[PDB]
Write a protein that binds this ligand. Sequence first.
Ligand SMILES: [Zn+2]
Ligand SMILES: [Zn+2]
Lengths: 274, 88, 49, 365, 97, 165, 136, 179, 156, 88
Amino acid sequence: QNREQQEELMRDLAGSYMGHFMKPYFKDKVTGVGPPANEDTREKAAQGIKAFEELLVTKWKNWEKALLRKSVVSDRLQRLLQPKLLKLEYLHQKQSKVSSELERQALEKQGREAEKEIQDINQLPEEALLGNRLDSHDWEKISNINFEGSRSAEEIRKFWQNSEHPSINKQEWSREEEERLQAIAAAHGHLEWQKIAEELGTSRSAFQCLQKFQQHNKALKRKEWTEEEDRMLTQLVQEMRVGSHIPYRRIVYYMEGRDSMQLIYRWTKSLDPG
Amino acid sequence: TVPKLYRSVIEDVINDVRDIFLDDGVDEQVLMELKTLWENKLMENVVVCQYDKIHRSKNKWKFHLKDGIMNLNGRDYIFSKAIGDAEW
Amino acid sequence: DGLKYSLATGNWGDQKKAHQARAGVSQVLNRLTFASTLSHLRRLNSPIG
Amino acid sequence: NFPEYELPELNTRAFHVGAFGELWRGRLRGAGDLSLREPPAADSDREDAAVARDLDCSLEAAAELRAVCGLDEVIPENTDLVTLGVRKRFLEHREETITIDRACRQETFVYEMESHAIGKKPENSADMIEEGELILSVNILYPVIFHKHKEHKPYQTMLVLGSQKLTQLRDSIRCVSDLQIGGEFSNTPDQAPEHISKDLYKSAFFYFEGTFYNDKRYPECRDLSRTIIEWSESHDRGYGKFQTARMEDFTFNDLCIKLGFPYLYCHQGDCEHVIVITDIRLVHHDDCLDRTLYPLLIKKHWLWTRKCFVCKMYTARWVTNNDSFAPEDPCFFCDVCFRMLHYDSEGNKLGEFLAYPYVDPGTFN
Amino acid sequence: YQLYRNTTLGNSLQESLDELIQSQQITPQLALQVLLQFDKAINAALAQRVRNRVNFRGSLNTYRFCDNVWTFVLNDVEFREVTELIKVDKVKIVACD
Amino acid sequence: PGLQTDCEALLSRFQETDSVRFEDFTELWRNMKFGTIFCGRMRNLEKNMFTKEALALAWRYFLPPYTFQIRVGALYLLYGLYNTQLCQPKQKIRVALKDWDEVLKFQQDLVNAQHFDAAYIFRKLRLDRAFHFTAMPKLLSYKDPSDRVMKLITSDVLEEMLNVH
Amino acid sequence: FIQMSVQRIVEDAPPIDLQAPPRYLLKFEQIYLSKPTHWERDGAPSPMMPNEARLRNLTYSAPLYVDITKTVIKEGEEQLQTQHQKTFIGKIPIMLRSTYCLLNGLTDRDLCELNECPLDPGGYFIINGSEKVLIA
Amino acid sequence: SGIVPQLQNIVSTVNLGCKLDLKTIALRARNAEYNPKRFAAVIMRIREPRTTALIFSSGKMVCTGAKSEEQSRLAARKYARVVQKLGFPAKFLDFKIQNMVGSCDVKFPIRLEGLVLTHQQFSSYEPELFPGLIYRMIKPRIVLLIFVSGKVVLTGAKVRAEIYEAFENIYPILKGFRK
Amino acid sequence: IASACLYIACRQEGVPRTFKEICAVSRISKKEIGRCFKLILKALETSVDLITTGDFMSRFCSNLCLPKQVQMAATHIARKAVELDLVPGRSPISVAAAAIYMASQASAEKRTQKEIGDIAGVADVTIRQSYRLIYPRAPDLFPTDFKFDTPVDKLP
Amino acid sequence: TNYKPVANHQYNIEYERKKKEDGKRARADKQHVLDMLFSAFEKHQYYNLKDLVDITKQPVVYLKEILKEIGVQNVKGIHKNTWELKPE
Ligand SMILES: [Zn+2]
Ligand SMILES: [Zn+2]
């Protein structure tokens, strides 16, 4: 019995996690990859059912924004330099084997012109180098070299083009600007926010205009309770209760145009049976 | 993903050689028809790659490949890192 | 060895440079009497040169 | 077989649940301990006689034992012990640092989930659980929905009933993956909702210690474990001797498993959950005695709820990728903002985007 | 580099350049310059445009090493990309670094 | 958080009396006011968690390899703790299958030794259904011990050996 | 000399500049002195008492250490700066009954415990067991 | 005792009798490796005898990994035939077995410290450099690696009888130092 | 050759050092030091007594700030461990490091595996491997008359 | 801590890895070596044997034999006798 206890104790010393199973429960110990996706998985992907990792959203950090800016600048510099650098290399190669002098001097003059063009490109200002939030940069390279893979190419492209470009006015809104936005939304309709942003004058994205309108809107919530809505709230609460815990966020989304605070107040002050 | 990489490579090559086309004395229309011909014509299993580390055990070969394009079953695939094992 | 050699022998400068090395700076302390010990520790030398 | 520590304080050797339950019921056979009945001067004499017969003592001795061994709140607490002193100091610190001193939402939620169904008598008296039913306190690990799920793994614990056919827990595990709606509704969002993923992909399987119990109940169901078995049968993967079953001719009573060891439960193609059996115990009289609802959710993680990126008042009824308006590529919208931003006047999509119906994991799970 | 001018992309580029040469619309010097530029561009793109790991298992039939190029020939091979399986009877891997 | 220290102190103060009667345990309970260990403001969740911890610790002390005196003291501790609970659904002592033999033989020895107090306490605990007959002592996820020398050699064994010699 | 001159001498020494083209620099900043130590045959250090130096014909010397910072430039817009803390560079003979002598601040009773005469004034060096006085 | 060493490796050399162009062999062989920046030989591997051959430009081939003299000779002849099919005038001249490496287990722990103490003139035991005792047997020119686990590896022999006699000579010493 | 001669002399006089303690001083690596050591021992036709675990005890514990009591405790632990064959075929330096670690952990002055590895030039993995073999037999290796503040009855 | 025990100096392991990586210089064909020598001759009239080795990247003994076959060394009174790439 004592030696069995000792064996138990050594296997305690030789014993050993949950993480090794999580998504690939079956996985190889030489390659570390699980079994191939089931045909059901392929069919699910075909129907465009986003997986949990595909719907995973992470906030854009400030250092990420600065890294994006720097990477885009470097990308544009490289893309504008590679052509002229290659031209200069070709001119040098031709100079190496020209078998002539006057042609060699002409090639030297062309190379000097190319070097001047390269210098001009190098000293280009940041404003003219960034672009116009609609030119095609190498967004996929940024996802690999600049970013270590934490951001996909499409995510970076959308963030740069729609939000983080300098041509998007990120400054705080003004009262006159807000009033103009409200008037344009009312007259032009709340369904063409691209044309609203274009007509707003200031360089703004349709998303920003819609966000500001919603945050200052007054028809977003119903703002008045009705008997039918009260009955719906009571039924939903009685259905989704587990005791004294009433999760109002989950109740809200069966209610139309309501917030959790409104339901909390309504069920605590008026619809409470007590 | 492979078609996107091929298109990007074609665009990069065209942008890089536009200067030579302009300089040597051939119009950019020749460049455009080159791009169109390459794209149109884009439409044995061989893997062309670079080796990071070809380890050889007693009989087990472990291949660490930096990058490569493979031609499996008449379909082209791309990989930026390959960790393979084999038994001679 | 440099500091030890100079104190051990009383020659100052490197060993190879003993030609110009000052001699007698380091001497074995006189322990014949306590007065001779005190005097030796307060001794002043006037090199001729 | 006897459950014993395979690992020091982490795992138990594989044993048949049926043998374990039979052992427990035979060691308590006719002992008056497995009752499942509510707790109830004449009875004093009967109790004394029973004590005398069980302890081989005289009636007067039994009465003396009964009277002497009898049982032996108030907010004030003084003459504190070390633990009571620690509690008093903690209470004083909380009082001096807190202003409301109420149970937090998480605490009340957890308590109500744990005590949601305790002592709930059946309404029919025909679904009453037999005296001794081998309750399994299973727990299902939530999938990786948010990134931090990898670091700390949240789980939902269910008190499954022993001698209960499989596919009764599979139909009870509430996961958002079963409510996914396929297809892209970018062109028009008023399409008739496609059948939820619970209907299209009915296949699923448990994996408990080298045995794939596949859910072949319905014609639409087909072997998901076939891919894994073929993958293992390949050159060499350590795993081997995989078994197969039907999952409706087996019960938790006929299962041979370990306690605290991660097993697998796959459904909806590749949605995988870690099944861990915390402990197995005989049914008591102070817990739920029903069978209609015994696959009972004792605890759930209360996941976060995604909000519309335009307005932070509503959740995400739609997810848009490759959007020409959204800042982020995967952008979440409610119905109102999505309609106002993605359709001019009659459903003609503005710009380019791929919009899909998104069900909030924090609302339906 | 004379390695990536054998796949579908490099081959098709080779025949396209040949078609221009026989059409008297471009000179061979520009053809070879374009080929070198394509080699550099494809190398840079693959090294910087691609992020996806594959794992292949097989029974190495033969191998060969010379002048810094490995030539493996494997039989009954299976490649594993992100999620899918690709099974082939025989494959040739030409590596150079 | 100090509960183990209280349990150890109570068990030590019970053993120092060298007695098995429940009267001494009741006197110690009243003097130490151990029944107030559950007293104090604490919501139902943490209250039942603390009760679970106390019952588990008492049951652990009730099982070997502790001495007979410590085991019987832990038995009275279990009785008192379970009978004095502030939780409406009184927490139950988790009993494993591997330990059932030890507990049953301990009860048999107690009744054999005329220690009717401890036997009656255990019988009352069983009749009230205070035991959750689980598979293992604790849910699985992811002192005064007894020596073998006394079992090997003692007064009677050596007396018999020398008589034979 | 020990507290100021030695440190000033090390500080005033020009940094060592070496060119290959990788470039190497050595800068000596801080000087440390340990108490007079003697290393046994096995290599175990131990404090060296002046009487033991006299008896065993040892030199009453204290180890000298210097903090050395090395910076290397390889014309690759990278600079690596590695510091070797307390680099042994030699041993300084110690004047007895000085601030760096083991018999510093010891009371007369303590000196007698070490077989040292309290009336002994110090002010000399033990060099191979010989008491050497530096004449001004 | 009744246990005898089992040969693990046999290194032999042969003279092909003609200069070779290693580049051609590397480019035309089935399993050859040629890295002039790492070594100056062509490394060929075969499966039936499971041996590795290093082929040198001078025409001298070194075959290793064979588990028997006949297997080594057959592998060397196979390599000679392979080179012959490549268009070279390769023959089989001066075949010689240069080393015989065998392993065995006396099946009892051995006290290396005492062995080195009493056999200082032969054994060299340096735990810092190698955890095994190196015994330089003198009657046959063989070197024995002897470990505390009992494993004994004999190397440096040209004939199997040399290994057998070396093990017979060493076994009594190990038995006398049985830990 | 000079490094090998220095190592040979240190080994001969009875205060042996480790090859890593000569490599850290010389400009060559341990491999060449060992090769030249063997070559010199072969050419000179001389031999050196095998190193014992007690030879590296004094220097290792003097480089560390461990008291003399801990030094004696570690020496006794290592000697008894080698006598009891708890570390078969392992280098004496690793055994010395393990003994020093257990003596420091049990004594008032505690040292982590990193510092002991740096002082003795032994990788912490080797220290753990040599410590687990003598882990269950900690008490009987300690001196009978040994005072400590952290019980020898409980250790990492 | 001075001379704290270490198996290999960081520079020593790096140098051993670098020497194994670059490898020894191989014997290139005479024609290629000759072409490189003649091509470099245009840059400067005379070359040092050590400097010429780096440019050609060939074994010293092999390079000397090739140089002797065509080239000769002229005694210069300014620094020393150096090889002249001109055979005549
Ligand atoms: Zn699921
Ligand atoms: Zn919204």
